[PDB]
Structures are given as C-alpha cells and as structure tokens.
Scaffold this active site. Structure first.
Site, PDB file in Angstrom:
ATOM      1  N   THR A   1      15.837  26.481  -2.439  1.00  0.00           N
ATOM      2  CA  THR A   1      16.391  27.795  -2.610  1.00  0.00           C
ATOM      3  C   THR A   1      17.185  28.190  -1.383  1.00  0.00           C
ATOM      4  OG1 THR A   1      14.445  28.875  -1.719  1.00  0.00           O
ATOM      5  CG2 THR A   1      14.498  28.405  -4.065  1.00  0.00           C
ATOM      6  N   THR A   2      17.843  29.324  -1.501  1.00  0.00           N
ATOM      7  CA  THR A   2      18.710  29.826  -0.464  1.00  0.00           C
ATOM      8  C   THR A   2      17.958  30.774   0.445  1.00  0.00           C
ATOM      9  OG1 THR A   2      20.586  29.626  -1.947  1.00  0.00           O
ATOM     10  CG2 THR A   2      20.798  31.017  -0.040  1.00  0.00           C
TER      11      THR A   2
END
Lengths: 246, 38
Positions: free
Chosen positions: A33-34
């Site tokens: 994920t970011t």
C-alpha cells in the site's frame, strides 16, 4: 533474472558489482500500500492507504502506524512484520540512547542505529533482508526531520515521501506543493492536502473500498509530540478531498 | 517396344543423423546448500 547463479544467495557480488536479492526485495515493496510523509514549517504529517479486504473488519483499530518514544513515528509500505520487527528494535535502542545521555534520541542518530543495522543483513548469508521501505520523522531541538528507509540500507532526507504502488503518482503531487509553497506549509492544510493524495493514489485499486489513516507531529498543534487524529479534523479532510475530485 | 527414358535423379533430399557429441557441461552445483553458508 540476469544471473541464475548469483541470486540463490546473499553476500555475493555479480560481475557487475551487484547483489540481486536486494534488487528483488524492492519488488516486494511495490506490492504494498501507499504511505507518505510531508515536511512542514513546524513538524510532519504521515498518512497511509489502509486497505480493507472484507466488510467484516473493525474500523480504526487495525492500525498501522507504530509510535516510537513520543517524538518520532514510523509508517510502512511493504511486508508489515519485517517492519514491526524493525521499530521494535528502534523502540528499544533509543531508550539505550536515553539512559546514557538523558536526552530523547534525535532523529539522525536514530537513523544510523537503523540504517546501519539493516545493512548488516545484506552482508551475511544466513539471513534475509527486509522487504520494507519505512518513512520516519519527528521533532527535536534543531527543528523537524523526515527520512526514507530503504532495504539497501540507504536513507536520505526528504521534504516528501511516497512508496508502494502509488509511487509514480504521489511523486508528482508532492512536487507541485514544493513549488507553490517553499515557505513551509502549516499543519492544518497539509493534512487535508494529504487526504487529497491517497484518494488520488487509490486509483490503481478502484476495485476495492478502503479506509484512511493519518498521524501527525508538530510543535504548535501538539506541543512537540506524536499523535493520531480524530474528529472534525480528519472528517473534514475526508470531506475536503473526495469533493475536489468530483 | 518402348522409347521413353527414366532419368532416375536425386530430386529427393536425405540426411544422416548421428550428431554424437562429447562434453555436456550443463550444470554442476557444488553448493547444494552452500555447506554451512559461511
């Protein structure tokens, strides 16, 4: 797969002075994920896409930020446990920097006790490196700081950071701001200005719903410590964000 | 009785395969587990 022989192990060197197992770990961060962190005129704000795989997960208590002793935070993007293994070394040594020197550990001297540790894994043979790239910053005597950690052992000082699969995107919207605002954002617009990004960075994964998380450290609004968010502050920041992109 | 010719030629191809060779150096692992790795 340039070398079928020089990948089965670590602690080797290719003919081109490389070691590829590091160059394959980095492809485990990309499948994550970011996560970002903005530098500000007083402190920092962190953020993350917190994906949800089902409807059954409880909200706001499968948190992902890990808070080190009251003045530095660390966020991950990658393989989580190798991460949580890592703060759980950063959360203990800093004490062992305190009980000898009595000051809270600064930020750089916290890095070299990580960035020098990680490099140890990538020179033995009986181990595996880390599949993380964790951001960490905070506040100290001499201002704010913010860094990136990267499984090669490198770390560098960033005004803006972004990892995961939303790298190529959020490395733009953090280039814009640092042209508009060389004078230093305040710690009550960067936040909502972060929410704008993770809602923009999601669009590699428009399939699935998700949840947004923030954690923020700056002197004025908090008196120099680390803290999560709650209430109107993030809710408006949500309301700010998905507005502008519709 | 018969005036035609035949002219048996080699219009067909052909081949003989015994491409026998020697080396086969393919893949020796002397580090099946790197032998204590260290």
């Amino acid at each position: 797969s340039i070398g079928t022989g020089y990948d089965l192990s670590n602690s080797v060197f290719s003919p081109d002075g490389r070691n590829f197992q590091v160059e394959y770990a980095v492809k485990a961060v990309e499948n994550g994920t970011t996560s970002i962190g903005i530098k500000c005129n007083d402190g920092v704000v962190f953020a993350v896409e917190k994906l949800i795989t089902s409807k059954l997960l409880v909200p706001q208590k499968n948190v992902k930020i890990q808070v080190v002793d009251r003045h530095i935070g660390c966020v991950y993007s990658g393989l989580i446990p190798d991460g949580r293994h890592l703060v759980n070394r950063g959360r203990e040594e800093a004490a062992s920097f305190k009980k000898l020197y009595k000051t809270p550990i600064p930020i750089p001297a916290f890095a070299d006790r990580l960035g020098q540790y990680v490099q140890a894994h990538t020179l033995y043979n009986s181990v595996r490196p880390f599949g993380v790239s964790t951001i960490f910053g905070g506040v100290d005597k001499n201002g704010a700081h913010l860094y990136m950690l990267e499984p090669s052992g490198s770390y560098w000082g960033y005004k803006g950071a972004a990892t995961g699969k939303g790298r190529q995107s959020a490395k733009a919207e953090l280039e814009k701001l640092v042209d508009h605002h060389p004078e230093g954002l305040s710690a009550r617009e960067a936040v909502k200005q972060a929410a704008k990004i993770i809602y923009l960075a999601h669009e590699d994964n428009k399939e699935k719903d998700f949840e947004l998380e923030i954690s923020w450290c700056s002197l004025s609004e908090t008196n120099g410590l680390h803290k999560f968010v709650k209430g109107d502050l993030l809710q408006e920041a949500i309301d700010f964000a998905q507005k502008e992109i519709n | 009785g018969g005036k035609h010719t035949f002219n048996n030629e080699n219009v067909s191809a052909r081949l003989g395969g015994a491409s026998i060779a020697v080396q086969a150096p393919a893949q020796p692992p002397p580090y099946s587990h790197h032998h204590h790795h260290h």
